[PDB]
């Protein structure tokens, strides 16, 4: 049945490689090079269930509202989870999660011009501070740890933005972009700059002037360069977008209300997004395509994607005068101005269709109260997988079984709103709870919108949870809507992830690749899957179930090895098997290998008994949790080996007699199977030739009750007699 185990290995590798190659953002936009830009959002299939179901409104505390009634700058600090508000430098930071932890501050003069939160340089600062507050006033800028001040020569700063490595950049009505070095200010240069965006992965800084001019600045690989790469006028952007569109009025391309950074985890080819009013997304590339290490050279426009309302067949109203936007992991959240007081929130995402080569998105509109001032967001790699690991980041459905939903906070005058993006598993849970049971009409549409394999993987994520009502409903939905076989394969591949093709050892001395807590979480998920399978294509499915059980036992063995001294267990082994372990995978160890598991078990038991401890506990545990990798034969072999190793002491002569006799009795029933020529060596080493003769006689009498093999066994008796 090793072929059935081997066959399911290609089935797991198929679904693992299927979720290994996914289209990039540039590929999703159907662009091929920065010389032929493409336009989407109008082909009636660009924009064909609750995208978010979390509306938690925490009102602004009345102490702040009373002062608000009497500047009105606002903002949020997601790293510290304390939203702030400003009424003439009376800056109070309240905890937007529950409306608490008021932090009044009105020490210096009024009329602050900019507020920023900076993660400080880890080198030179007191350890008790975790963040920095940078307040900009017309006379000077004060930096306060959570110190001293720096004067600005009458420059009206408007925005402050921090890099990941602690560099603070300010901009304002002076037209120049400044940096605070900590102290001094340095100018990196009629048009006020309103926004500064930071690309932390590729170290690219963007700006967005009042007229609309976007300037790309290159920080370099080090992050300290700050050289202007490009400077594109707004008219150039409008003309380029018109030429790419050729059928769209240019009034939607101007003005530009937001610029966002497209992270290296989302695209290797597109590095900037420009959101203009009426919700128009202009995709800008600053570096050559598919070159992760190429620094920016010019700011070019490669794609023009339209909002949902632009399509001829679309009945959705277009967004109107959007003033805030964010783009995170393919999710666009933009705030349109319905009135002076109310607002509309647009959520556009393609997490439902992550593999379609042309971009396929879904949109949601949510009416809220309060003008928006701050809308913000709250893999295991091995050398044997470096060439197969997808570089950027996995989609949502790949890691939805273990990743929490992405959380966002929208702050207005009335109060903060907390929401999170529903994972497909969350949408299925909402459908199951909203429906009476685990079947009906909304579940069928969920399993039809996603593929049957992906939908069954999501259903297994919900059904292997170990509350009971949702688990039973998810199990019924899984069994009601070969699709189940592919869903099981995909879910098992997503549980294992990048560990199935990964080596169980990464050099450093020699330690386990997977951390203990991650391994335990994977083990619990696999235990849930195995319990699901036990409670409930037949030959292939049974082979895959056996593979799941075998891999669960292997993972339990790996976890218990990590609990013990993994370095000692791996080191105390023959060099050939260690080198084989270097370039073998979990797939090969579970399936192809049948020697390294026993070697690891033997090393673990030897380490346990070299501590002068009874083996009866660890042997019982191994037999309980690894029946396939550890049989009763291994148990009696371990007991006899323990007796032989602990009988190498000269405390008493009569003590040796009973111990060696019982060890020989254990060896009598195991002489046929393992180590006939191995244990006789130590038997003669402990001066028990009488035992060697008896053991070899037992081997001759039981192994060959043929003639040639019995004579071969008697040759051992002759060799011992002559020894």
Swiss-Prot record:
* Function noted in UniProt: Essential component of nuclear pore complex. Could be essessential for embryogenesis. Nucleoporins may be involved both in binding and translocating proteins during nucleocytoplasmic transport.
Keyword Chaperone in the entry? The reply is no
Q: Name one GO biological process term.
A: protein localization to nuclear inner membrane
User: How would you describe the post-translational modification of this protein?
Assistant: Phosphorylated. Phosphorylation and dephosphorylation may be important for the function of NUP155 and may play a role in the reversible disassembly of the nuclear pore complex during mitosis. Disulfide-linked to NUP62. The inner channel of the NPC has a different redox environment from the cytoplasm and allows the formation of interchain disulfide bonds between some nucleoporins, the significant increase of these linkages upon oxidative stress reduces the permeability of the NPC.
Gene Ontology cellular component terms for the protein in this record: cytosol; membrane; nuclear envelope; nuclear membrane; nuclear pore; nuclear pore inner ring
Protein family: Belongs to the non-repetitive/WGA-negative nucleoporin family.
Q: Which gene encodes it?
A: NUP155
Summarize subunit and interaction data from the UniProt record for this chain. Answer: Interacts with GLE1. Able to form a heterotrimer with GLE1 and NUP42 in vitro. Forms a complex with NUP35, NUP93, NUP205 and lamin B.
Q: Which disease is it linked to?
A: Atrial fibrillation, familial, 15: A familial form of atrial fibrillation, a common sustained cardiac rhythm disturbance. Atrial fibrillation is characterized by disorganized atrial electrical activity and ineffective atrial contraction promoting blood stasis in the atria and reduces ventricular filling. It can result in palpitations, syncope, thromboembolic stroke, and congestive heart failure.
Keyword field: Atrial fibrillation, Disease variant, Disulfide bond, Glycoprotein, Isopeptide bond, Membrane, mRNA transport, Nuclear pore complex, Nucleus, Phosphoprotein, Protein transport, Translocation, Transport, Ubl conjugation
Per the UniProt record, which residue ranges are transmembrane?
none
Q: Where in the cell is it found?
A: Nucleus, Nuclear pore complex; Nucleus membrane
Q: How does it sit in the membrane?
A: Peripheral membrane protein
Name-wise, this protein is: Nuclear pore complex protein Nup155
Molecular-function annotations in GO: structural constituent of nuclear pore
Q: Glycosylated where?
A: 434
Q: In which tissues is it expressed?
A: Expressed in all tissues tested, including heart, brain, placenta, lung, liver, skeletal muscle, kidney and pancreas.
Superkingdom, natural source: Eukaryota
């Amino acid at each position: 049945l090793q072929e059935a185990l081997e066959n399911a290995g290609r089935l797991i590798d198929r679904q693992l490689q299927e979720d290994r190659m996914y289209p990039d953002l540039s590929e999703l936009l159907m662009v091929s090079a920065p010389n032929n830009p493409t336009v989407s959002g109008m082909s009636d299939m660009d924009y064909p269930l609750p995208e978010i179901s979390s509306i938690r409104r925490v009102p602004l505390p009345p102490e702040l509202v009373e002062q608000f009634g009497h500047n009105c700058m606002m903002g949020v600090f997601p790293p510290i989870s304390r939203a702030w508000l400003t009424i003439d430098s009376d800056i109070f930071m309240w905890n937007y999660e529950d409306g608490g932890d008021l932090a009044y501050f009105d020490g210096l003069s009024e009329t602050i011009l900019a507020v920023g939160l900076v993660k400080p340089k880890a080198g030179i600062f007191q350890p008790h501070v975790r963040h920095l507050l940078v307040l900009a006033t017309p006379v000077d800028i004060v930096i306060l740890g959570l110190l001293y001040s720096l004067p600005t020569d009458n420059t009206y700063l408007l925005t402050i933005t921090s890099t990941d490595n602690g560099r603070i950049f300010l901009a304002g009505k002076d037209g120049c972009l400044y940096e605070v070095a900590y102290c001094r200010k340095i100018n990196h240069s009629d048009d006020p700059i309103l926004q500064i965006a930071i690309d932390n992965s590729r170290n690219i800084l963007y700006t967005r002037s009042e007229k609309g001019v976007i300037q790309v600045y290159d920080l370099g690989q080090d992050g300290q360069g700050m050289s202007r790469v490009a400077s594109v006028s707004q008219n150039a952007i409008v003309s380029a977008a018109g030429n790419i569109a050729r059928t769209i009025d240019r009034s939607v391309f101007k003005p530009i209300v937001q610029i966002a950074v497209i992270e290296n985890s989302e695209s290797l080819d597109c590095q900037l997004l420009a959101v203009t009013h009426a919700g128009v997304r202009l995709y800008f590339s600053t570096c050559p395509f598919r070159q992760p290490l190429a620094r920016p050279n010019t700011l070019t426009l490669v794609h023009v994607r339209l909002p949902p309302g632009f399509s001829a067949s679309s009945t959705v109203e277009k967004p109107s005068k959007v003033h805030r936007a964010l783009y995170s992991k393919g999710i666009l959240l933009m705030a349109a101005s319905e009135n002076e007081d109310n607002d509309i929130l647009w959520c556009v995402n393609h997490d439902t269709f992550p593999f379609q080569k042309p971009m396929m998105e879904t949109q949601m509109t949510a009416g809220v109260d309060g003008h928006s001032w701050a809308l913000s967001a709250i893999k295991i790699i091995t050398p044997l997988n470096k060439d197969h690991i997808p570089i950027t980041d996995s989609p949502v459905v790949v890691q939805q079984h273990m990743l929490p939903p992405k959380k966002f906070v929208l702050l207005s005058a009335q109060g903060s709103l907390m929401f999170h993006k529903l994972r497909p598993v969350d949408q299925l849970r909402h459908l199951l709870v909203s429906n009476v049971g685990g079947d009906g009409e909304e579940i069928e549409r969920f399993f039809k919108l996603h593929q049957e394999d992906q939908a069954c993987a999501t259903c297994l994520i919900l059904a292997c949870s170990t509350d009971r009502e949702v688990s039973a409903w998810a199990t019924r939905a899984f069994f009601r809507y070969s699709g189940k076989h592919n869903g099981i394969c995909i879910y098992f591949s997503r549980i294992m992830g990048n560990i199935w093709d990964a080596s169980l050892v990464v050099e450093r001395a020699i330690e386990s690749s997977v951390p203990c807590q991650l391994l335990e979480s994977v083990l619990q998920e696999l235990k849930g899957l195995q319990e699901f399978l036990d409670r409930n294509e037949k030959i292939s499915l049974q082979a895959i179930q056996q593979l799941v059980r075998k891999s669960y036992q292997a993972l339990a063995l790996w976890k218990l090895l990590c609990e013990h001294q993994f370095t000692i267990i791996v080191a105390e082994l023959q060099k050939e098997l260690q080198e084989q372990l270097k370039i073998t995978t979990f797939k090969d160890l579970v399936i192809r290998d049948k020697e390294l598991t026993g070697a690891l078990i033997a090393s673990l038991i030897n380490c346990y008994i070299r501590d002068n401890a009874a083996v009866d506990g660890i042997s019982l545990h191994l037999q309980d949790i690894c029946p396939l990798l550890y049989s009763t034969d291994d148990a009696i072999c371990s007991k006899a080996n323990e007796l032989l190793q602990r009988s190498r002491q000269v405390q008493n002569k009569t003590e040796k007699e009973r111990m060696l006799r019982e060890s020989l009795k254990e060896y009598q029933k195991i002489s046929n199977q393992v180590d006939l020529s191995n244990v006789c060596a130590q038997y003669r080493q402990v001066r028990f030739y009488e035992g060697v003769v008896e053991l070899s006689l037992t081997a001759a009498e039981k192994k060959d009750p043929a003639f040639q093999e019995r004579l071969n066994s008697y040759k051992c008796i002759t060799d011992t007699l002559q020894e």
